Design a binder for these strands. Structure first.
Ligand SMILES: [Mg+2]
Ligand SMILES: [Mg+2]
Ligand SMILES: [Mg+2]
Ligand SMILES: [Mg+2]
Ligand SMILES: [Mg+2]
Ligand SMILES: [Mg+2]
Ligand SMILES: [Mg+2]
Ligand SMILES: [Mg+2]
Ligand SMILES: [Mg+2]
Ligand SMILES: [Mg+2]
Ligand SMILES: [Mg+2]
Ligand SMILES: [Mg+2]
Ligand SMILES: [Mg+2]
Ligand SMILES: [Mg+2]
Ligand SMILES: [Mg+2]
Ligand SMILES: [Mg+2]
Ligand SMILES: [Mg+2]
Ligand SMILES: [Mg+2]
Ligand SMILES: [Mg+2]
Ligand SMILES: [Zn+2]
Lengths: 25, 214, 127, 63, 97
RNA sequence: GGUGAAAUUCUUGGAUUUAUUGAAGACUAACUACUGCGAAAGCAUUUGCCAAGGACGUUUUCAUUAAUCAAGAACGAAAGUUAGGGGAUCGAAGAUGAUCAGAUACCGUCGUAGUCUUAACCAUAAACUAUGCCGACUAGGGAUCGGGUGGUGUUUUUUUAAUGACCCACUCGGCACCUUACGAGAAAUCAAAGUCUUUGGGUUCUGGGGGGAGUAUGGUCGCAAGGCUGAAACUUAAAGGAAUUG
RNA sequence: AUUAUUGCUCUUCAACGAGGAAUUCCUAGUAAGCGCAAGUCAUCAGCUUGCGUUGAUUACGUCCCUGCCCUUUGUACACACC
């Protein structure tokens, strides 16, 4: 996939793990 | 079941003084009925005729003129100065590559107190033995020419109204005084007052207006 | 010699405007466009139409009072194509060849000291 | 009807997308010393005589 | 790899020029990289000039052409106008005709 | 009106076209170039002010004061964020007319944020010459931008000059092109990418097969979005570059 | 020999009044018209392969349509755009 959109893929992907981790702080 | 033509009042346009043909053209109004008359309604229109279409000669192909209608009298309406334009084609021709353009302007008053803004354009010429294919001034050159142009333009106005200013613009006296003071600085070709607009007329004064007529 | 008025032929694509008015402009005299004298949208600017409309416009122009007329041909302008449309030349041709005089004509296509962002976005109208 | 006679003086070539059309310069006989190029419909060689139905008007290219 | 030394088009010692809008599709494109033609042409045309002077006043008149500079976007330049495509070498030739 | 063609749309409210005026915000057309300047981002209307700069000129001054740089700092396109203002235009989102088997799009319409500006953030771009800086050396050519020097050069007339613009030779320092190639390179190409197994002028920084991955983690910066720093397990025989013929 | 091999005679006497959008073939002893021999074949040519007979109109050009070649140019394809 376009590198630009793979970067976006994982931008989001991190935002969710950033989110799910917070539930547990 | 109308056709406003089988109704429209008709009219011819007369020009001011310091040119050639005072007769100019025709127009349509509406019959001066009680409530909404042909008179006070419009008249105040304006007309654009090339002055070569109004001076006869062709050493004036460009240079357009705005005439505004101020007064009316029995199928005869005069007109006065309202501006001066250039033709689109002439400029587009004057403005060629490989050379520097120069423009400058000023707002200023006249005797009979019409205020106006006159324009001025000039391009750098190669001079007849040059080798380099372009010819550019030196910015420091450009700033000089403008200031002098401006010095000259302000002087030429507030002579006896647009009246004398019109009488001044027609034979392009301005053009060559520019040409004069300038050649101490840089070459230059074309050089014209290009434009001039009106923005602050005084008061009607039915007297003074009537001085161009006879 | 004649009686004079203004022609002003706006010629964009998809339509061509012809309408003569008083040399002051304030007062019209007969119009009609290219979209009038044929019906197909697609052909709304074609030279064949603007002819037939330059024909119907010449007619009235002389059937009212104007014996002659100067022209001011014009394109879309502004932040648009700025180039002459198709049925401008056909219009001019049709109104001189009609039975009307011609005198000193210039271009009046609005040209900006550029700006107001063009339409269709940075990547262009793409198809 | 003003008939107008012209003698083909040179064969220039084939215009028309199709190409059935030949470009030709002619010399009209009744008072020479002038020339005009015409477009033909049929096969043509040098020294042929074309009846220009209207003397003064000529074309160039064809599509 | 690389394909031109002028890269895209004409820009050495500057770093930023400023975009124009394509006359055909309106695509932005740096002015130096543009591709341009003065669209100098007559107001009338081929045939009209006779029928022009014929039904006009004045002697032969004067005749004043139109002048407008054209800005194309490469693709638009390539799709119709000046372009073709040249050999590896003919590319190098900057001469117009 | 708009299109390849259409439709959504606007039209007794005289639309679209015309004319005269006015207001709002944005922008700087043409002149504009293998042309200028800036550390880089970047910078094209005028005029006044404010300080700044390179190059040149120099038989002025000081005299090793310099080169390059972990840390640290200044600035930093666009978007994006906070708080005002502004909000013309174009216009992420959204809603539509069509197209399509589908059509969350391309094309058309409506148009929110935005686009502009102030105060503060953010610090990233293929931020590109994909090419560190200082110094020396190595090879031809015609242009050009700035500075200077030389001339019983041209053109400007007045009374010769003085000027200014122009012409020719030279010389510094700019932006580039040309041809060559002693030389270099895997080549494409390169006056540097040259002066390297005949391997050393000074200095900074980064890379060490591919994926995993700019991921996990910790630290840190941020309002946020995210920036900086930044692994391993595992997987894998190629991935990659330039040129050739198809 | 019926589902009628072919041939003859009488009778029966259809559609078809030059053919929409489309589309084939052709430049001289050619097109078209005309019949013959040969192949097949016990018997059956509305087919074919050749043959001679009568014998034109119109081009002797072009790139518009369609088809294919050739350069140039892109390619991450080379089992090569299936
Ligand atoms: Mg919880
Ligand atoms: Mg395309
Ligand atoms: Mg490539
Ligand atoms: Mg940049
Ligand atoms: Mg400007
Ligand atoms: Mg520390
Ligand atoms: Mg650092
Ligand atoms: Mg807005
Ligand atoms: Mg949508
Ligand atoms: Mg839909
Ligand atoms: Mg969507
Ligand atoms: Mg980076
Ligand atoms: Mg680049
Ligand atoms: Mg050199
Ligand atoms: Mg294997
Ligand atoms: Mg390759
Ligand atoms: Mg047989
Ligand atoms: Mg058979
Ligand atoms: Mg290849
Ligand atoms: Zn384009």
């Amino acid at each position: 996939m376009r590198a630009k959109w793979r970067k976006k893929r994982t931008r989001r992907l991190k935002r969710k793990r950033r989110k799910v981790r917070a539930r547990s702080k | 079941v109308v056709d406003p033509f089988t109704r429209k009042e008709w009219f011819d346009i007369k020009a001011p003084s310091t040119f050639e043909n005072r007769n100019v053209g025709k127009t349509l109004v509406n019959k001066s009925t009680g409530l909404k008359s042909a008179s006070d309604a419009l008249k105040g229109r304006v007309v654009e005729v090339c002055l070569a279409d109004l001076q006869g000669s062709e050493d004036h192909s460009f240079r357009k003129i705005k005439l505004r209608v101020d007064e009316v009298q029995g199928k005869n309406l005069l007109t006065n100065f309202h501006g001066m334009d250039f033709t689109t084609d002439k400029l587009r021709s004057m403005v060629r590559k490989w050379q520097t353009l120069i423009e400058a302007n000023v707002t200023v008053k006249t005797s009979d107190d019409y205020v106006l803004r006159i324009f001025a354009i000039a391009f750098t010429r190669k001079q007849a033995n040059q080798v380099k294919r372009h010819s550019y001034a030196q910015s420091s050159h450009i700033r000089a020419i403008r200031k002098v142009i401006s010095e000259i333009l302000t002087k030429e106005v507030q002579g006896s109204t647009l009246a004398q200013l019109t009488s001044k613009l027609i034979p392009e006296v301005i053009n060559k005084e520019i040409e004069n003071a300038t050649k101490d600085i840089f070459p230059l070709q074309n050089i014209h007052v290009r434009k001039v607009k009106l923005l602050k007329q005084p008061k009607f004064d039915v007297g003074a207006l009537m001085a161009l007529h006879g | 010699s004649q009686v004079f008025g203004v022609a002003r032929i706006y010629a964009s694509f998809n339509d061509t405007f012809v309408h003569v008015t008083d040399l002051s402009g304030k007062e019209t005299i007969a119009r009609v466009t290219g979209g009038m004298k044929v019906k197909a949208d697609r052909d709304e600017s074609s030279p064949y139409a603007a002819m037939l409309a330059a024909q119907d416009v010449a007619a009235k122009c002389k059937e009212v009072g104007i014996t002659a007329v100067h022209v001011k041909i014009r394109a879309t302008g502004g932040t648009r194509t700025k180039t002459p449309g198709p049925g401008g030349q056909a219009a001019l041709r049709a109104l001189a060849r009609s039975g009307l005089r011609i005198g000193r004509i210039e271009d009046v296509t609005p040209v900006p000291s550029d700006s107001t962002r063009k339409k269709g976005g940075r990547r262009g109208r793409r198809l | 009807t003003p008939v107008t006679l012209a003698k083909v003086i040179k064969v220039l070539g084939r215009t028309g997308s199709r190409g059935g059309v030949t470009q030709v310069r002619v010399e009209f006989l009744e008072d020479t010393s002038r020339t005009i190029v015409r477009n033909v419909k049929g096969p043509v060689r040098e020294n042929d005589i074309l009846v220009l139905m209207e003397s003064e008007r000529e074309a160039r290219r064809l599509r | 790899p690389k394909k031109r030394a002028s890269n895209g088009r004409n820009k050495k010692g500057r770093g930023h020029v400023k975009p124009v809008r394509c006359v055909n599709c309106s695509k932005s494109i740096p002015k130096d990289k543009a591709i341009k033609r003065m669209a100098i042409r007559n107001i009338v045309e081929a045939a009209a000039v006779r029928d022009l002077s014929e039904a006009s006043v004045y002697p032969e008149y004067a005749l004043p052409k139109t002048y407008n500079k054209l800005h194309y976007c490469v693709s638009c330049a390539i799709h119709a106008r000046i372009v073709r495509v040249r050999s590896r070498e003919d590319r190098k030739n900057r001469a117009p005709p």
